[PDB]
Design a protein around this ligand. Sequence first.
Ligand SMILES: *[C@@H]1O[C@H](CO)[C@@H](O[C@@H]2O[C@H](CO)[C@@H](O[C@@H]3O[C@H](CO)[C@@H](O)[C@H](O)[C@@H]3O)[C@H](O)[C@H]2NC(C)=O)[C@H](O)[C@H]1NC(C)=O
Ligand SMILES: *[C@@H]1O[C@H](CO)[C@@H](O[C@@H]2O[C@H](CO)[C@@H](O[C@@H]3O[C@H](CO)[C@@H](O)[C@H](O)[C@@H]3O)[C@H](O)[C@H]2NC(C)=O)[C@H](O)[C@H]1NC(C)=O
Lengths: 214, 245, 223
Amino acid sequence: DIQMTQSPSSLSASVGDRVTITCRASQSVSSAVAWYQQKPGKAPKLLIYSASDLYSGVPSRFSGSRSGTDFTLTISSLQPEDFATYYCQQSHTYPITFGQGTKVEIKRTVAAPSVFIFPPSDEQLKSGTASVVCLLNNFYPREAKVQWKVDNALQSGNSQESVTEQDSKDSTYSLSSTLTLSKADYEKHKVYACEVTHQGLSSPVTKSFNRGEC
Amino acid sequence: ATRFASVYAWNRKRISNCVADYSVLYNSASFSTFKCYGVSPTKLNDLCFTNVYADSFVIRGDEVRQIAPGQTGKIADYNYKLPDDFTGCVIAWNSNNLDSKVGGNYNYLYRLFRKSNLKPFERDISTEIYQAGSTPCNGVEGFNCYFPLQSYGFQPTNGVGYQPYRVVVLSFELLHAPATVCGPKKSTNLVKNKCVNFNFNGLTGTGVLTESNKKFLPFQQFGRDIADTTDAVRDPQTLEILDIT
Amino acid sequence: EVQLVESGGGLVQPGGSLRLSCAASGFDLGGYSMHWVRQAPGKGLEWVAGIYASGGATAYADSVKGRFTISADTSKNTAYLQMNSLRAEDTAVYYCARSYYYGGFGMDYWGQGTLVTVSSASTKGPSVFPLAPSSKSTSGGTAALGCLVKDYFPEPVTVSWNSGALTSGVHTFPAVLQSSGLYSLSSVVTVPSSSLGTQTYICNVNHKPSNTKVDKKVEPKSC
Ligand SMILES: *[C@@H]1O[C@H](CO)[C@@H](O[C@@H]2O[C@H](CO)[C@@H](O[C@@H]3O[C@H](CO)[C@@H](O)[C@H](O)[C@@H]3O)[C@H](O)[C@H]2NC(C)=O)[C@H](O)[C@H]1NC(C)=O
Ligand SMILES: *[C@@H]1O[C@H](CO)[C@@H](O[C@@H]2O[C@H](CO)[C@@H](O[C@@H]3O[C@H](CO)[C@@H](O)[C@H](O)[C@@H]3O)[C@H](O)[C@H]2NC(C)=O)[C@H](O)[C@H]1NC(C)=O
């Protein structure tokens, strides 16, 4: 049981830029680490094997080397087909162990989300519960969160999130989040709000509604 | 060379007591690449060393770039270190026209499974099963137990980074001994009855050099005047005694 | 070119089991180790097991010992994975992959994988709820109507609008697995806001694997 550490957890760069990603094993794995690319909906593809040997079918743009005890992958120039999650596999000693996967993003224009808040509907409330829904469309970059408030108080422990895939032409995506209240708690509050932010946004988008509205 | 070894089983060979045409592969173009480190690509025949090495092995094209005196890389640091106390040149031919075939080439077993790095100028052939895991293998393969030396599936259809190359390595040594190897030397034409600035086997002077009436033992090479001034030479190639006026 | 094709995916009840298989083509199994790797939604790759076809020897991840068994058949040129005593936590896409000898080499070629999901309800239709729009518009002058699809099984679920006729302006979120063992997601249609009173917006949740669908009308409310 040899564990994997990777860095950075994500990387963002433009087309033609140089990319370096590193992988570290907790024990010696010699030079039997392999790199793989994964795209959404697809199985991983071998990129580099036996630490530094490039796999046929992989562009010459890919290379790498060992420094000290760590192994570094380098993309000399990113092309659109090189944006993938990058994994390391240690096959030297069993069990075969994989790292988390480093996400590489294509640099795109940064933008604020379009925020749509849907107050609990009459039909939703028939369950005896309430669910406040905030949907954030078409924004960029990938690291983002939905911050919820009830009567201007910050909420915690009562929310859920789901995130979609990024668009191949502009890398935008959307977040979806909710607040769970019993109907009885919903009825005791007056003001609800959704504050949305992300790593590239200097001005969070704020939307709100009154209890019972819509 | 007719035959090459794997890199791990580096075919180490020393060259001594001779004339080595070091630049022969620069000019012949029988190898795809001729890259020199500390010595010149050409006019390499002008280098006199006590010994030189002339080693031969088969590696991948990307590994050909990795091997150089004093340099690092997976192949350079683990299977064979080429030291920088020596100067040298790494020369390689594309062996798709010799070694590659479908099924691979089993005369070239490369070390994959190791506990440590091999030393400068160190050759090895061990077949002992390698322990990757926690328990001894005792000669048996299995998960976490491996055969240390393996063949590559070198084929005519692989790209250059993986294609095999026949690599010959030139390495130049100086030790506390008389030198025994250098490249070929070139003489100029001999002119006798004219003033010439002469150099015979390292001995110099200016004069007119004509046939002598002196005799000498097969042993002897030069005649001498007061205070050891040369007054005769025998030609190094022509067996005539020549008087220096 | 070499190929690996997974099959035998499906649904499992908690405490139950499923057997997966993968066929090889373009190469034999002998001389190769066959491996299975799982990837739960939201997770990275986790190795489960490997078998050396010319050996009969196997290796397993500690995380699957006592539950997963790996085997292979060189006459059929196939690999197998027997997955026992499964939980909702075990939902994942299970992939077959090839590597050389007994390891020390990475995997090269991978199959594409098949989904296995574990739940107490082999089939379940969703309760689909409408989501009333905010009356305040966004950039571009748009607004949206939407729905929530809750407690259904199995995933994947396809969501579209106007009983399947509306794809234009349709945006959906991926489903996630809840504590109920069932799945849920949200969906909207974004148009210039005046179109929300012109076009038909019925949330169409399609469940081909259980031969059903849910049709829920969504419309503007006073805000
Ligand atoms: C390694 O093989 C290469 C092949 O390219 C050798 O180069 C070639 O060596 C031959 C020797 O037979 C040369 O032929 C000679 O040509 C000269 C004039 O060109 C002629 O006077 C001789 O009678 C003889 O035919 C040939 O020219 C030469 N090719 C090139 C392109 O230079 C090389 O010598 C070999 N090296 C060793 C160490 O064996
Ligand atoms: C160094 O090499 C030269 C070649 O350039 C050698 O000279 C050659 O010596 C041979 C043997 O004497 C000669 O063959 C015979 O020579 C005699 C008289 O020259 C002639 O009558 C015969 O018909 C026959 O050719 C050869 O001609 C001669 N070549 C030249 C250009 O002189 C020389 O002996 C070598 N020196 C040493 C120390 O080995």
